[PDB]
Design a protein around this nucleic acid. Structure first.
Ligand code: MG
Ligand code: MG
Ligand code: MG
Ligand code: MG
Ligand code: MG
Ligand code: MG
Ligand code: MG
Ligand code: MG
Ligand code: MG
Ligand code: MG
Lengths: 195, 101, 72, 132, 133, 128, 520, 37, 304
RNA sequence: GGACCUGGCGGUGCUUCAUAUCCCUCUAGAGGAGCCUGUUCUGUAAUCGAUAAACCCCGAUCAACCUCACCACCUCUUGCUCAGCCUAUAUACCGCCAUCUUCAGCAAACCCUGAUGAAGGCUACAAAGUAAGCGCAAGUACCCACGUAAAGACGUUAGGUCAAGGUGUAGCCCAUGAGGUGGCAAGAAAUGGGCUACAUUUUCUACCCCAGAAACGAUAGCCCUUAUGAAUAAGGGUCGAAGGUGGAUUUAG
């Protein structure tokens, strides 16, 4: 009984705001899309399936949104919000001089309602001992204590922390461990002096 | 409305093993410890022997979710091989193809 | 990955340092050995929280106190 | 002889769709996956849950939109969001279509505690790729 | 003809605290379709260059995990079928990047994900020394 | 279980057993043949045990220019609708199963005196 | 909110209303199923716990007078409160807390009619301890749910012993009363309440209708509002704009209010009054009477939420497009062709007459096609209008093809509906222009269509002209078998045939000429 | 829990929204069997 | 038929739409732009381009079909219509006429190409006899008209290189000339730099071959290139390796040494090396094991 | 009973072939001994099924207890199930596959021939075939265009599978259903597939290849240790035989 109006293809003009008609990620909706894009294995004496009943367009991911024009628009909008990097910091040596203590965490992101995942707790940190210890006795002491967390080829000590589930807990525990390690390498023992 | 009575039994076993999980681990540690008194290890053995059945994690089995098939199941997907091959051929799940390597 | 579930503002030292929870036994006995190893494993384990760890501790305390008849 | 997700050849009076016409070894060669999630990829988990919820909602909406569909579903899970995509026929009324859409959306949301949206494409009669 | 007069701009506040400086943002996108990954990384690098930041690119190898099941049900051990998951990696490295820039860029990209992709971030931040040491 | 359930066309296939051994060789069957049935067309999407009135699909959405809401079908109305569905299915099955009277020609079970109607129309168009 | 495909595309206001109402009904059905079977959705699979998604619990607990009283304000009903008052007065005879009694009275006054009478006469048994809060809430209830003498008695009692309490009291007093209004205002301003001007808004609502002797004092009252400096001029301003309603437009006050609302638009708005929904609708109602285009543009951040109901949105858009049509109209049709899919008979009539006065003939076809595509079917008022306006024209020779096409579509729509009986009187009214346009290339169609028309008649002068032009545009017999028959039918075709028969018609055969002579 | 799944879907069928063709077939053959004894 | 023009104009409209979308001058616009745009907007892991999404010119999408061969009524346009092979036979008739005309005066084209140039299916035998007509025509003299007629069908031979490429020499500090090359294998990848002025010792990962290869056949393989060239003790080489198999790394070194020596050595001697067959990566690698059998090729015992 | 059409068959003729297949040929193996694991058979109260090609480390990419479906004993009766059933029927089936296939044919819709019969339709310097569609093929996957995989139609074996699951029919529906203790799963014997060695290309020692010694062999048995479990596996000491390179026949490349 009811009949559907013809699609918006002939209605849409050549001058048109594609970023406005497809701002976010969404399905293909050939009724709204004017392009004759077809996709499918053509049959002998045939051609691919027409865009209307071609659900493979929907099977595949969609990237009609996020065109170069939309990207330029969003970057022009968001450059007001982004900040500037210190021009003085323009080299790895300079950045590690300003802040030798490197620290990095990491976490995956996955599709689905649940978001927690134990690997979120991982964290590690790195620092070169060539400038931090300022002494030799404690240097020998701590390099003897640590088993393999050092690397002299690169001249950096690196340590991992996962004993705590929370990233901030891992961070605080690593900081406390480093502090106590320095404080305990400062001093020594008599059985340690006898070698 | 589980698939069958054996699936019902497996679920009861899993639930019992969970709700007695910590206790089983603790007393098993107290049994397998070496330095503590042998009489204490014997008391712990008696405790484990007096514990109820269907509470240990060994009696359960990694059965299928749908077909209740004990064997021929992948631990990752939890499904039986038949159903896996079925819906993979139908292309229901994602990012899986035939290995024509 | 932790929008919520902050472990009730718990602390790394509250997780790891159990010396305050370890008060009702000397520092040499086999019970001390066992509970020190237990605390080591617990501090190593992040999956559980200070709550579960203290329940574990009270569990062991009560059990070996009602089996305190030996002290051998 | 292997029979797997393929249709027996008839005299030539059998309308068939693309996905069930092509064989299960043309998945990546000449088809796409109906569902799209990362549980299958390495490093992640919950794949069994993804698959079971997929089949559940597929059968659910198939049985709540009887006689109207003309293909399998297409699922698009972008992070927490869920997007269903279907192709149906213009048999019943838009009233019923919208009401059932809202009902299914609400049920899926309250059940899986997930933000869900649904899209459907109308066709006069189900498309046919070949006559087998 | 309908063009708004005054664009509603959200509020922003420059808190007294200093923003944290991320030394290196190394993100790793895993997918099934190399074309999807190419479009995605082109999108990302173009957005980054329009934001005004350096960029590096490299494509780790394609990994595959395959396994064999029975082709039949009851008794056929000679005849099997195989299946495989192909995962494809693409790494995007950014250097000398401020914390707020990281936040805005990662939020943009995280809203702009495609469907069949996982995203693994590694943040490297440089910090001073503690006070107790 | 609900997951164990599956589409009806394969159920009907497996119940009919149209092909696999009974058909081939011409052995056939001793005059028993299950007729396919379509329950999808039988009842509209509205029918259920709890007879809730749905203005979206079951009842017209507007009445006298007044919006409707969910309501209850009492026990008497529910059993009335159930009897109506029972009788309707009965007449459907009756009209389905009936006699077939092809004009007896030379004899019963003989294709002698039967006419197939006029010839078929040609492509160019020639009604015979 | 609406889908994208064209079949589900809601193409009319009433059907779109019904559609999203069906969606809301599905939402309510979802609420019903979840609150009827909570245990099914009880699983908190999602890592972030969300009470918006958790099932909803309106379940009274076990008998516990104190916890039951605390749960009263949680359950939001009246039977529980009746039962709790029963349990506390009959067998217990004690009050859990004065705050609990106050909350019970709040709920019962909000819920309120013999039922309201019973609920109000069952509150005087409450323990002696009845403070201001209790008395003024009783006043609130008796005002907003029952007559006003009870509220006045309660207020006198309170005096013998708040902002919106006195607001309700003023509503009760008001709903001619010059001294009453004056003394009310005076003592209200005398008291130290310092209202939030909702009292003023309510007294304006009551002054919805009055002559200048209260319309003009409203201006000085508003100036006093501004002097004290509280009002944003969101609702009282609009209400006085409405009270301005009118035998003669007041251009001076109109310009004044134009400047006022101009600076109000220039500044940013924040909502404070629940009655800002009638603002939009009645404002545009006054704008329609005013008839100004700079005014319409001025009336045109997130201030678009105040439209709300589809009825008010409909009134606004209707009056807006009507003013724009009755204002060149190229920019108007541009705005229109821009907003037609977003936007939703009278508007199209105004469009048709605007296009007529503009003389832009080529545009009307597309507009009719759009209306037909959306919902223009089974009604011939607009068909008659478009046909008359388009065939008053014949000046485009090449456009006669489009004339024939749109005429054929109009007839395809006209003849759809026999069962309704409405399509029978449509040709008698508008078939003449349709057949003229069909005549203006194809001619046999118009010939047989006029045949059907006359064999259904109501002849007409332009019908005579049509017959004459058709006959003169080669075939004597083909022209005769029409003109002679219509002459034998009616007299004016006969007085025209008197001249038609001169050229070549009468020479063919005399039997039809004999019939003409007999009829003449 | 197939408990939750099946109970929810059974309640929803009784509501009369999800036409479970499997149960329809089953109950049809059940009716026929109880008719034939 | 009018659907063709419908699709053509719709394709132009969609092309303008896409040009406006991507932000370029819609007039100047190309098929490579179209294909890149549709690839970016509609990715696909599909392996076959035929199955990947395509927005192509309709004239090239739809195949050519013979138009109505007869007017509104009555006769057909061509004079062979009542038989098949109308165009084929008309062309053969024209060829026969030209051939007998030349008589009184006195690469090839694939069957599928001929089919898709015409609007009718073809047969192997008629293709063969047509080629026979062509070749027998060309055996004799041919005028300009005949030459152009034949070249209308004749296609490009498209010859290959049949030669081993040459890498460019390089120069590094203290004015040292050299040439670097890379070799591969089953599982071994190596890179070797040949120094011309140098000679004598040879390095591999910082170790000499005499002690890195205890076995003699490996060094025999290493020497085979220089031994064949006669360039033995005037040119030295350094190299780095990453591989599993000994003989694999050996062959990789061989290929890399040859590919680096090809630069310093003359072209004729490069050709001599190619003929010797030491400049080609052997494609042979361990076959896959099949699931049902015991090895890459061996099956379980057929027990009967 | 006479004469024919199609197919199978021929220890049927001519011709051309046979890729690791027919042979001649090439290599390395199985039937020798021990051991691991299945099958047959014996007994037991003790599952089930396939059980030539096209099963025999097969359902099982696992059986100490659940897995278990058997059995003795002990309990439940609307019984988690708007019940349930591993109860019969794979000769009702779907679903999934072996198979000739290491094939290339299968064919809707038309036309023609045989006196308008069963049936056939092949001659290219051309005589009735035209052909939709499927498959082969092509192309895609891996390292190529080759190769390997994948694919491999119509159908034959009422081939295997009601025990993956579901289901038609026939049955138990105080049971032929459900629950919990225990063992059940050994070998007078025969056979299959695989591992070990029977030697000096060997055995041991450090490196994996320029050496030095001997002139062997246990993944079986006994004892011990440990892995996890509440309650088979790896390692260590001892035992140091059979065994002397295979009886017809036979496998893979
Ligand atoms: Mg187990
Ligand atoms: Mg096979
Ligand atoms: Mg008879
Ligand atoms: Mg068992
Ligand atoms: Mg049983
Ligand atoms: Mg069978
Ligand atoms: Mg194969
Ligand atoms: Mg192939
Ligand atoms: Mg059989
Ligand atoms: Mg053990």
């Amino acid at each position: 009984r009811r009949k559907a109006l013809p699609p918006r293809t002939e209605k849409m003009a050549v001058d048109q705001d594609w970023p406005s008609v497809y701002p976010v990620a969404a399905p293909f909706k050939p009724s709204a899309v004017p392009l004759p894009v077809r996709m499918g294995y053509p049959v002998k004496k045939g051609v691919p399936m027409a865009k209307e009943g071609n659900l493979e367009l929907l099977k595949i991911p969609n990237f009609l949104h996020l065109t170069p024009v939309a990207i330029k628009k969003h970057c022009e909008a968001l450059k007001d919000f982004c900040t500037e990097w210190p021009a003085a910091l323009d080299s790895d040596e300079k950045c590690e001089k300003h802040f030798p203590i490197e620290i990095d965490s990491t976490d995956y992101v996955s599709s689905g309602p649940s978001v927690r995942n134990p690997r979120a707790r991982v964290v590690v940190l790195r620092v070169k001992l060539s400038s931090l210890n300022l002494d030799d006795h404690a240097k020998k002491k701590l390099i003897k204590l640590v088993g393999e967390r050092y690397c002299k080829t690169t001249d950096v000590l690196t340590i991992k922390t996962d004993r705590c589930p929370l990233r901030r807990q891992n961070y605080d525990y690593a900081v406390y461990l480093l502090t106590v390690l320095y404080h305990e390498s400062w001093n020594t023992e008599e059985w340690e002096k006898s070698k | 409305h589980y698939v069958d009575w054996r699936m019902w039994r497996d679920v009861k076993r899993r639930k019992m093993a969970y709700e007695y999980a910590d206790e089983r681990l603790r007393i098993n540690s107290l049994r397998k410890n070496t330095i503590l008194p042998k009489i204490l290890q014997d008391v712990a053995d008696e405790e484990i022997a007096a514990l109820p059945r269907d509470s240990c994690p060994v009696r359960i089995r990694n059965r299928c979710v749908m077909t209740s098939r004990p064997r021929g199941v992948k631990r990752r997907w939890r499904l039986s091989r038949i159903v896996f091959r079925h819906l993979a051929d139908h292309g229901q799940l994602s990012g899986i193809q035939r290995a024509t390597w | 990955n932790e929008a919520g579930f902050d472990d009730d503002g718990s602390e790394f030292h509250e997780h790891i340092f159990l010396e305050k929870h370890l008060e009702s036994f000397p520092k040499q006995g086999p019970i001390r050995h066992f509970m020190e190893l237990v605390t080591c494993g617990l501090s190593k384990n992040p999956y559980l929280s200070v709550k579960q760890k203290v329940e574990h501790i009270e569990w062991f305390r009560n059990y070996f106190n009602e089996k305190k008849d030996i002290l051998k | 002889k292997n029979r797997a997700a393929r249709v027996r050849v008839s005299k030539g009076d059998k309308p068939v769709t693309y996905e069930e016409a092509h064989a299960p070894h043309y998945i990546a060669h000449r088809k796409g996956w109906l569902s799209l999630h990362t549980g299958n990829l390495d490093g992640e988990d919950h794949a069994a849950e993804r698959t079971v919820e997929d089949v559940f909602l597929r059968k659910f909406m198939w049985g709540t939109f009887p006689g109207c569909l003309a293909d399998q579903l297409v699922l698009k899970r972008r992070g927490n969001q869920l997007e269903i995509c279907a192709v149906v026929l213009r048999q019943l009324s838009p009233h019923k279509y919208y009401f059932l859409v809202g009902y299914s959306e609400t049920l899926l949301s309250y059940f899986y505690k997930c933000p869900v949206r649904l899209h459907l494409q109308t066709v006069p009669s189900k498309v046919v790729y070949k006559y087998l | 003809v309908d063009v708004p007069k005054d664009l509603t701009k959200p509020v922003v506040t420059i808190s007294d605290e200093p923003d944290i400086l991320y030394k290196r943002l190394s993100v790793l996108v895993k997918g099934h379709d190399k074309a999807v990954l190419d479009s995605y990384e082109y999108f990302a690098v173009l957005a980054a260059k329009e934001l005004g930041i350096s960029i590096k690119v490299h494509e780790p190898p394609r990994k595959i995990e395959r396994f064999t099941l029975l082709q039949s049900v009851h008794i056929y051990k000679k005849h099997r079928v195989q299946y495989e998951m192909r995962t494809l990696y693409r790494c995007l490295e950014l250097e000398h990047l401020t914390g707020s820039t990281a936040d805005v860029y990662l939020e943009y990209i995280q809203r702009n994900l495609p469907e069949g992709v996982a995203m693994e971030v590694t943040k490297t931040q440089l910090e001073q020394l503690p006070e107790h040491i | 279980s609900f997951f164990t359930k599956l589409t009806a066309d394969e159920l009907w296939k497996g119940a009919l057993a149209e092909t696999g051994a009974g058909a081939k060789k011409g052995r056939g069957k001793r005059t028993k043949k299950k007729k396919r049935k379509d329950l999808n067309r039988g009842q509209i999407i509205g029918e259920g045990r709890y007879g809730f009135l749905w203005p979206g699909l079951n009842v017209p959405l507007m009445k006298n220019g007044a919006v409707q809401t969910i309501a209850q079908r009492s026990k008497e109305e529910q059993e009335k609708v159930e009897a109506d569905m029972i009788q309707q299915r009965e007449e459907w099955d009756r009209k389905k199963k009936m006699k077939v009277k092809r004009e007896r020609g030379w004899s019963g079970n003989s294709w002698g005196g039967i006419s197939l109607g006029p010839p078929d129309p040609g492509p160019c168009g020639e009604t015979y | 909110v609406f889908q994208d495909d064209p079949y589900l595309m809601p193409a009319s206001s009433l059907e779109s209303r019904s559609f999203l109402l069906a969606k809301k009904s599905g939402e309510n059905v979802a609420k019903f199923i979840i609150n009827s079977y909570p245990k099914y959705f009880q699983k908190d699979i999602a890592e972030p716990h969300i009470p918006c998604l958790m099932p909803e619990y309106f379940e009274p607990q076990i008998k516990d007078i104190s916890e039951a009283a605390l749960k009263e304000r949680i359950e939001l009903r009246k039977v529980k409160a009746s039962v709790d008052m029963f349990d506390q007065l009959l067998q217990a005879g004690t009050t859990v807390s004065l705050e609990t009694t106050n909350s019970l009275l709040d709920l019962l006054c909000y819920y309120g009619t013999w039922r309201a009478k019973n609920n109000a006469e069952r509150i005087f048994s409450l323990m002696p301890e009845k403070n201001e809060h209790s008395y003024c809430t009783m006043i609130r209830g008796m005002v907003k749910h029952r007559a006003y003498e009870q509220a006045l008695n309660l207020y006198t009692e309170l005096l013998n012993n708040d902002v919106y309490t006195f607001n309700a009291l003023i509503e009760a007093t008001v709903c001619e009363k010059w001294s009453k209004i004056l003394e009310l205002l005076r003592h209200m301003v005398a008291q130290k309440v310092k209202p939030n001007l909702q009292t003023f808004n309510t007294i304006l609502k009551c002054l919805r209708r009055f002559h200048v002797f209260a319309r003009s004092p409203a201006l000085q009252v508003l100036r006093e509002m501004k002097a004290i400096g509280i009002e944003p001029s969101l609702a009282t301003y609009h209400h006085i704009i409405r009270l301005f309603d009118p035998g003669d437009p007041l251009k001076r006050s109109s310009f004044i209010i134009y400047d006022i609302m101009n600076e109000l638009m220039g500044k940013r708005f924040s909502p404070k009054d629940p009655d800002d929904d009638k603002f939009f609708q009645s404002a545009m109602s006054i704008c329609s009477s005013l008839r100004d285009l700079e005014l319409a543009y001025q009336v045109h951040g997130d201030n678009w939420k105040f439209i709300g109901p589809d009825q008010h949105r409909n009134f606004y858009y209707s009056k807006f497009f009507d003013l724009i049509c009755l204002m060149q109209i190229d920019v108007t049709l541009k705005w229109y062709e821009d907003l037609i899919p977003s936007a939703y008979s009278q508007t199209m009539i105004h469009l048709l007459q605007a296009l007529d006065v503009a003389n832009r003939l080529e545009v009307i076809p597309k507009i009719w096609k759009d209306s037909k595509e959306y919902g223009h079917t089974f009604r011939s008022d607009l068909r008659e209008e478009i046909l008359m306006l388009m065939a008053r024209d014949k000046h485009p020779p090449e456009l006669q093809v489009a004339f024939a096409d749109c005429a054929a579509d109009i007839k395809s729509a006209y003849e759809s509906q026999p069962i309704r009986q409405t399509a029978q009187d449509w040709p008698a009214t508008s078939l003449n222009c349709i057949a003229i346009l069909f005549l203006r290339g194809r001619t046999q169609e118009a010939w047989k269509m006029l045949g059907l028309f006359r064999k259904h008649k109501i002849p007409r002068s332009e019908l005579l002209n049509e017959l004459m032009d058709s006959a003169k545009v080669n075939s004597p017999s083909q022209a005769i078998e029409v003109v002679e028959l219509a002459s034998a039918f009616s007299l004016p075709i006969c007085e025209g045939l008197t001249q038609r028969v001169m050229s070549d018609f009468a020479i063919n055969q005399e039997q039809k000429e004999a019939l003409s002579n007999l009829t003449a | 829990n197939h408990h939750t799944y099946a109970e929810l879907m059974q309640t929803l069928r009784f509501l009369g929204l999800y036409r479970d063709e499997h149960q329809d077939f089953m109950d049809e053959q059940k009716r026929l069997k109880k008719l034939r004894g | 038929e009018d659907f063709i023009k419908k699709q053509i104009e719709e394709f132009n409209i969609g092309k303008r739409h896409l040009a406006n979308m991507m932000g370029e001058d819609p007039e100047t616009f190309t098929q490579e732009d179209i294909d890149r745009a549709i690839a970016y907007l509609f990715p696909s892991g599909l392996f076959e381009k035929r199955a990947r999404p395509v927005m192509k010119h309709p004239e090239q999408i739809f195949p050519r079909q013979r138009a109505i061969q007869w007017g509104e009524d009555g006769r057909p346009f061509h004079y062979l219509f009542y038989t098949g092979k109308q165009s084929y036979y008309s062309l053969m008739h024209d060829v026969y006429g030209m051939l007998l005309n030349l008589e009184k005066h006195q690469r090839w084209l694939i069957k599928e190409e001929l089919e898709e140039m015409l609007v009718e299916k073809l047969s192997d035998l008629d293709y063969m006899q047509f080629i026979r007509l062509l070749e027998k025509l060309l055996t004799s003299q041919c005028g300009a008209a005949e030459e152009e007629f034949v070249q209308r069908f004749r296609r490009s031979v498209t010859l290959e290189s049949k030669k081993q490429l040459i890498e460019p020499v390089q120069y590094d500090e203290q004015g040292m000339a050299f040439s670097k090359s890379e070799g591969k294998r089953k599982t071994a990848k190596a890179e070797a730099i040949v120094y011309k002025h140098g000679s004598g010792r040879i390095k591999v990962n910082g170790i000499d071959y005499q002690l890195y290869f205890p076995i003699t056949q490996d060094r025999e393989q290493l020497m085979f290139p220089f031994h064949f060239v006669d360039r033995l003790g005037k040119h030295d080489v350094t190299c780095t390796v990453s591989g599993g198999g000994r003989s694999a790394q050996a062959g990789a070194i061989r290929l890399a040494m040859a590919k680096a020596l090809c630069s310093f050595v003359t072209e004729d001697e490069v050709e001599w090396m190619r003929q010797a067959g030491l400049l080609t990566t052997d494609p042979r690698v361990r076959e896959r094991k099949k699931p049902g059998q015991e090895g890459a090729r061996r099956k379980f015992t057929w027990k009967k």
